[PDB]
Amino acid sequence: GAHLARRYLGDASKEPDPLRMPTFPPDYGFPERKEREMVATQQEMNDAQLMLQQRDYCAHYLIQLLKCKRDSFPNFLACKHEQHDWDYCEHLDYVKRMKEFERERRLLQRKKRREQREAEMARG
Amino acid sequence: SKMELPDYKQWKIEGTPLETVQEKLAARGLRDPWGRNEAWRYSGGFANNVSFVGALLKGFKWGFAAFVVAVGAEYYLESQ
């Protein structure tokens, strides 16, 4: 989707632009924001030679999965817990990205409406 | 080896869709003189066939029975 229908048919001014996001400072409405941490060191990721796309914030679960897959090689059904853990981390990352997009949407609409209301109040 | 053709008089259009075709042609005053030539396609072992969904679910009964017995064995095997 409905977001495509809203942006392409409705008012595109209050709909986020995927290529240009975010627009507002990261600490705009938040008073303080915790910095996102990592678990896997650069050297560990390089030694594991994961990929340039799999070196995301869920890379440590992926390294654990690769270890278990190598160790329990002939039994290729034994790598179930770690695969689920990696999938859960990826799902949480996607939820965080969805939160980011929705925050962009609400902030853009709120700021635009507030600016329009301020202009209206100054117009009378 | 040394096989002969079946007796030609056993081919009839009774009980076949050719009966319906002949019935509709007779109501128009026409006739179909070739139906007995086509009767063999409906007469014998070609008399009945499955549908599309029936064709898709060919080995469903035996597979379902095997799946059920496997699941039942699995449930009363973890009680060890």
Binding site: Y28, Y88, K99, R105 | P6, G59, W62, G63, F64
Partner: protein, 67 residues
């Protein structure tokens, strides 16, 4: 195996071919059912999809339209 022409009859079928056909259909269906019973999430999804509307403003961090 010797099979001879029939001339407007159903062809001769040996028990072996029907046995093989029924067997392979049965194993395909058993595999599908077993893999669905044990690996269901591969078709129905694993993680619940959130809905952005039910997200409170406090965790989201935008001001109440004043500042």
């Amino acid at each position: 195996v010797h099979i001879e022409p029939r001339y407007r009859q159903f062809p001769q079928l040996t028990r072996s071919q029907l046995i093989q056909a029924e067997f392979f259909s049965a194993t395909m269906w058993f595999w599908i059912l077993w893999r669905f019973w044990h690996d269901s999430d591969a078709v129905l999804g694993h993680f619940p999809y959130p809905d952005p509307s039910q997200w409170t403003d406090e965790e989201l961090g935008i001001l109440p339209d004043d500042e």
